[PDB]
Each structure stands twice: as C-alpha cells, then as structure tokens.
DNA sequence: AGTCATTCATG
DNA sequence: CGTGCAT
C-alpha cells in the first residue's frame, strides 16, 4: 500500500534523473554535428519523408506531427518553434529549413501557426544528412521502440561553429556564436594537415564570429581568450553612418544591429531616450526598414552634439551590447567547456564515419562482384543450367543442385534461380566491364580503410566543395 | 359502516391505504403484547396474516395509533376485507370463525380442535377486498421497513415477516444507540457514537448522536416509544442544547475571535427518545405527531447540555475539530446568501485527499476517474515556482502556490496551523517522465520550506504500471511471460487511471517522511538553492553519465 | 490565433 | 531583462 523514502533520497533520484536528461538530451548541442536532439529529429524526419530542398514545400503541421509521432515525444509548439527558428535567417548564419509564409521577423512578431506555413529542408541541410543511408552514424531505438533514429548526423560541414547554439540546462548553459562557413572550413583543413596547430595560427583562418545580422565585433584578445577556453566577453556594435540633413541638422543612420536583438524593442527604447530626454539632442526616431533593407533614422536637433548622443545610446541601449562566449557542447555523452577537444572529437567522429561508410560500400561492391562472377561462369555452362533447373523439384532443390553440380554458392544460386525468363536472351563482355569497375571500386575503398589519409583528404575535398557553394563576411572585426 | 367513508379511517390509496390497515393491525397486536412475539405472513393467496405469541377482540380492534366474538362492531379491517378468518388458542382448545366482505359471519366461533395445554395465542388472516381497495398486493419491502423501525423502541417485543410468495423472511429484535448505526450504515463517519442518558423530574430522555460527511441532517425523535414525525418541544430542546453548548466550547479555550446555529447540524444524525408520564403528554392538533408539552424543552436541553459540555471538554480531538467544521459550514452558508479546483463532495479532514496533478489534461482524467466523495483535484498548470530561488514576495504572488495555500486551508509559513487543514493526505500525481520528476521536486521543496509540519506528519505523498495482466518491475514481466510498454498515462483512460493509481484498494503511494531533518535540509538547499556551483558538483559527483 | 507565466544559466 | 526548450 505505502512505501517510505527520505526527502533527501526523493530529491536525489529526481533531480539527477532530470539533470542528466536536460544536459544530454535537450538544451545542449552535440559537439560533432552541432544539433540539439529536437533539431536533429526535425532534420532527420523531414529527410526521411523526402521533404527536401528540391521538392515542393510540405505543410508545416504534417511535418511536425510526424516528428512527434515517430521521434520526439513532446509538445508541437516546441517542435514547431524549433523548426521555425532553424528557418529564420537573422538567427541562423546558414539556415537549415526553408519556410513559406510568416515565420517571424527581426521585430520579433509571432510566426504564423503551423496550420498556415509550409516547409522543407534547405540545400545545405542536405549536407548535414549526406550519406546517412550508408550506415555512417550510430542509430538508437526511438522512445517508442518502433523505429531507429540517428544519435548524430554525418555533418559534411562543421555546423557547431557555423550556426552556433544557445543554450540553457541544469548546472550548465551554452552560448556559441555563428561563424563564416569558408572561414571555419579553412581552419579545419589546416588542422587536418597540422593537428597540433595553435590558436594564433588558427585565427589566421578563423578570425572570429560572423553574425548573420552583421555589425562590428570589437575585442581581438577576448576572441582569442574564448577560442582557448570557451569563455570570453566581446563587444558587438551597430554599423552606423551619419547624414547631413538640410538646415544644419544631422541624422544617425543604423543599418546593422547586434545579434539576438529585437529591432522593434531597440527602436522603442531609443525613442524612450528621446521622450524622456535622458540626453539632449534627438529630434525624432524613425524605423525605415522595408522588406529589403534595415534602416533606422535617429534625426538630431540643430546644434546637437552627435558624438554625445551616439555614445550614450551605445551604453544605455542595445545599439551596442556585450556578447559572452560560453562554448559548452556534448562530447562523449558529457558536457564540456571547449576549441581543441571540440575539433578533435569532430575529427575522430568523421574518421569513424568515413571508415564505416567505406566498409558499407565495399561490402555492397563485393556481394555484387561475387554474383557477377557466378553469372560469367553460368554462361559458359546456360543450356545445362536451364536443364538442371528443368530437372529440379522446386526452388530449394534447384539451388541445391546448382551448388552441388557446379559449385555456385547460395547467394549466387539465389540470384540465378530468381532471374526472369527474358534474361536468357542475353554477352560476357558487359559483365566483365562491370567486374573490372567493381574491382577498382573495392581497391579505392580498401585503401581508405587500411591507410586514414585517403579518408581525411576526402573530408577536406568535401568541406571545400561546401564552402565554394555556400559567402562573404557580414560582421567586421576590430581590435 | 366504515366501508362507506374508508379514507376517514385509513386514508385510502394505492396502496398507501392498504399498507395502512396492516400498520393498524400490527401496531394493535404490538400494543396488545406490550400489556412478546408478533409474526406477519404474506400468503400465496395474497392475503395477510398477523399472529401473536379477551386478548382476541381487544386485538382485532384497530385504527390504533398508540403504544406506551364480543366486539367486532367496527374492526376497520373486518369492514374492509373480502374474507377474514380469525382464530384463538386459549385454555386448552382452539376456536376459529370467519366472515365475508362487510364482516358478516360465515360461521359461529367454534372449537376446531385440541390445544396444547393452557398455551395461548391469537391469529388474524384477511384478504382486503379489491372493491374498496385498488391495490391488493402487499409489498414485503415496505412492511419490512415498518416492522423494522418499529422494533427499535419496542425492547419487550420481537417481530417477524415472512413472504410466502418470494419465499423470503426477516425477524427483528433490539436490546437507541443501534438506531444511529442503522441510520449511518453506508455512510462515512466524522465522530463515533455519542450517547447521553438521564432522568430529570418525571421525564426520561435518552439520546445518541453521530456525525457524517453528509450535508442533510437527520434527526429522529421518540416520545413514549412512538415517533414524533413532526418534531416537537423535546426536539427543540435538543437542537437548542447543542448550538449553545458548543458555542460555549468555541468561546472558551478554543476559537471564537470574540466580537452559529444549524451549521452545527450539518451531517449530524441523531435518535432522541423521551419518556413522558402521560398526564403531562400533550401534542398539537388531531394527530400525535408533534410534542407540545412545554416542560420537555428545558428537560431535554437540561440532560443533554449537561452531558456534552462534559464530553467536549473531555477530549479536544473530536471537539475543537468539530467546531472548526461548523465555521466552514458557517463560511459557505453565508456565502450562499452572498451568492444572490474540483472539490470533494463532503468535507472530511480525516479521510479527504488532495490530488495535485501535473497538467489540466491529466487533471481531466483525474476528475473523471476519481471517487468524488472524498477526493479533490487540483491541476497545476506549468512548472511550479522554485520556492528556494524566488523571493517570498513573488512566491506569495503565485497562482499555483497561492491557491494551494488556500485549498489546503492552513495558511503558510509560521502563521500555519496543521489542525485547520482540509486533507488527511495530499497526493502529488505527475507524469512518469523526467519533467514529472522535476515537478515533484519543486512541490516537495515548497512543502518543506513552507508547510514543514504537513511533510513531518507524513501527510504528503506521491502516486502507474510499466507493462501490460500488468507489471511494474522488469522481474514481474518474466513471471507473466509464463506485451505493451506504457509510454504515458495518456495512452490514460479515466477507467484505467483509477484501477491503477487512484483507488486506495489497488494503488501504491510513496509516503514522504522527513527522516534526518539536517541532511534533508542540505539536500533541498543544494539541489534547489540560488548557488549553481554546489549543484553542478553534486551532479558531477552523483550523476552517472557513462 | 494571440495572450498569459513558469524552469534553467548567464552577463 | 531576454535568450529557447520545457511545463
Ligand atoms: C502547458 C501550458 C501551461 O500554461 C501555459 C501558460 N500559462 C501558465 C499559467 N498561467 C497562469 C497562464 C498562462 C502560458 F502562458 C503559455 C503556455 C504555452 O505557450 C504552452 C505551449 O504548449 O506552447 C503551454 N502552456 C502554456
Ligand atoms: Mg508556448
Ligand atoms: Mg510529459
């Protein structure tokens, strides 16, 4: 009927249970592919369903429902909001979901509910899933024990640094900003060649974050500090021009703001400064951003000290903010503050992946080569093979007779005996061409397996392709 | 001659009239035995026969609302019967005689046989005529309830009922305290049976009282072994005794705040029985349904108000708790005239249960699957505020917290009485997931920080099967092996939720017990406190990532 | 189809 | 205060 437990014990089996899960399976990105579980499931499920960049948009609610019923046992709001975020190009440096309809704005207005919008994976998101069908990554059973899901994606580009992550669990939080794809890939490529590379040298390739929202990042040494330790405070400041209006008045024009800042709240707080006259000078605040351009006009009064006003806004609004690195990711099942262990785990991961992919393709190529070898043989001996099957009592007896009389293996016997009659109309040469192409294919793969360097070259070759395909810096760097 | 205006003698009906002359005959034969076994029988015929252990015609006389050959001129049954056969065994012979319709004698009273010595006994069997009666079908259920409730005050007598149609039977005998049990048989019980005896100048009053979780009060009264269906001065003496004896008990070392009535009678059931000397006996008009005799009010109020000012002082358990109940009754009552969570139907802080359920959704199934008599439902909507991290300002401005502080009814903090509570068990019912774990954690810390006594008196609990025949352990499924795996209660129907986790017969509740206050205080304050580093380390040290 | 509030960590 | 998965 009733069993006692201590207050001290209850709060222990519970908070441990929760803590472990929120850290491993909710708030924190995997260090290799840079995804939280909800995002990986989103991408995996839409890809399983062929809802890719090259096909028609599919209703958001259909996608969300499948994710919920197959992989992610939580609310649809959370899944949908997560899916929507991965589509907002002012939050993601390289968006992974393309969404048709109101998916929000820099002003932070609610996205349309998932009954209105429609979505599909972006082309680049395709590269996170590249080769997932090739047994390249470890799979587990879903919540449901009905279906397998991937525990990490193949990640043909370094999404952790490219898109970023944030980041609140139990005992740990994470803030990793976005970086330029070409830059991050240049760094990875250097490190592949020079594994013991030092930060100073890596920063010749990867000078610092690259926000989708652009702006100005100030703090070379804190950037360095963060690349070494995973923690660091940098300054992020709006791009600003001044315009000399008629009649001796000036006007400050903002055109890029700090990452994660709500444009509309910022505009209101700057106008609050004007309405309250905390500092003198501001004539009018005017948000002039249209569908193709961000532009805020802070018109000044005649004989207004524009440097004073600007500086004050920089300090007392989010016209300028501090951005704090707190690079935490999940490495070998546990939370790590990390650059060296991060990159190295990733590199070891790609190694396992590429090795596994190659075993898989080689296996396929061999099974085939083995059959093609049997068929080449069969042709030297058709008339008597048809005779033999003619004399067999049934399928199983026919296979047996093919093994016993002509040494075919089971697998070859199965193939031979399940051929359609029309095949008997058919040339050993075509087959020999195939036999040769398979042998070459197997040699390439077997090398990769027996020798690491061939594999790392492939990985660099593929990362460079991704870079060539997917843009220039947005955020300027300043000492 | 009574045949002509039958309602006057009986109040004819269908068949309340038919069931009225049987009352008359039975009460008559009782009255006769009083001055030791009456047996009634419904026959296959349809006829009814009352017999008992010149007794004869003093017996067949009826219209008989009392207790405490010769005639046969106006036996109101004889007049109202198809035939009526009558038989007496007396002195050493047995005599029979029967009549038809009006009561015109079909034969003379003759000796129809030899009787076993001087042994005496009287018997009347009759069939009402279907002329003056519209229903001739005696109901055994009704006759039963009569004979039953009759036999309580009739200590001298035992009476039986046999239905030869349905071949069933009872018998009744009672050696006023039992009556309150009989009255509260299938009900739940706030106080035990209180019994107060006493003589006081001629009058003999004898009362038992016993509260239930019910609402309607239920007070029966008896003067001189018969019922005063309409109450009377003795009743007013009894009611006026409690409302003023308990008010005193409140006023004194209890609770009154200085500066109620029928609120004391909510769920009160009581059987009250006085003996009046008959020369002082006076009722209202025509019928002896309402005692009017003035002295009865201050003698019953005497005897009762005395004994239970003693009883109340005698044990502050069933006492101050009982008063509080009156004020909860006083509270909503005046809040109904001011009307011009899902609560348990009846208020019983001794068996009542409060269910804090994670989510309005699960809250729904809880409301539907519950036993509404003693189980209340409180849906918590969202994660509960962390009562360690937040300020006692914001903590008290929280809906989930604020309404538990109210629904529980004991206040909070050091201004907190565990006796003004509302439940014997507060039960936390969450999802069997990680977030349910989290929720249990935030509620436990609130109850510890702000209602420690409730957790200290082992009042706080925590409520499902893992497998489907059901099993909870990985071991219990292998014993069944000689399979569906439950992912949530949502895969829960109200039916299943009950059988499995809410039913006090088929459920398992972990009972929170504050064992080592000091190492318990370290645990809450480290897991839920403002400081992150302690927690992080507790996790790093105790949490097996692998 | 918006709106309301709460956890968790951090500067 | 605001962030984003959770309730
Ligand atoms: C689980 C429920 C709990 O209640 C919720 C809210 N309230 C909490 C109680 N408050 C007194 C009133 C507001 C809320 F404001 C927002 C949400 C919400 O966005 C949400 C979701 O599924 O996305 C789900 N829920 C919400
Ligand atoms: Mg929501
Ligand atoms: Mg749940």
Residue numbers in the entry:
A (entry chain A): 3 to 340, 342 to 429, 431 to 474, 476 to 484
B (entry chain C): 24 to 58, 62 to 79, 94 to 108, 119 to 225, 228 to 311, 316 to 396, 416 to 538, 540 to 544, ...
Structure paper excerpt:
Topoisomerase (topo) IV and gyrase are the type II enzymes expressed in bacteria. Topo IV mediates the unlinking of daughter chromosomes before cell division, whereas gyrase is unique in its ability to introduce negative supercoils into DNA thereby controlling chromosome supercoiling, which promotes replication fork advance and allows global regulation of gene expression. In each case, the active complex is a tetramer of two topo IV ParC and ParE subunits or gyrase GyrA and GyrB proteins. By contrast, the N-terminal and C-terminal regions of the highly conserved ParE (GyrB) subunits form the ATPase- and Mg2+-binding-TOPRIM domains, respectively.
To address this issue, we have focused on topo IV from Streptococcus pneumoniae, a Gram-positive human pathogen responsible for life-threatening infections, and for which topo IV is a target for clinically important anti-pneumococcal quinolones such as levofloxacin. Our initial attempts to crystallize a three-gate open clamp complex of S. pneumoniae topo IV used recombinant full-length ParE protein and a ParC55 protein comprising the breakage-reunion domain of ParC. A levofloxacin-DNA cleavage complex of ParE and ParC55 proteins with a 26mer E-site DNA yielded a crystal structure in the rhombohedral space group H32 with a best resolution of 6.5 Å. One complex involving E-site DNA stabilized with levofloxacin was solved at 6.5 Å; a second structure containing V-site DNA and no drug was solved at 3.7 Å resolution, revealing two different DNA-binding sites. Essentially, the same open clamp conformation and domain dispositions were seen for this drug-free complex as was observed for the levofloxacin-stabilized 6.5 Å complex obtained in a different space group using a different gate-DNA sequence and different crystallization conditions. However, the absence of ATPase domains leads to some uncertainties in modelling the scope and accessibility of drug binding pockets, as suggested by the closed clamp structure in which the ATPase domains adopt the criss-cross conformation and partially shield the DNA binding groove from the solvent above. Reassuringly, the open clamp structure of full-length topo IV reveals that the ATPase domains are folded back, and the DNA gate is fully accessible to drugs from solvent above.
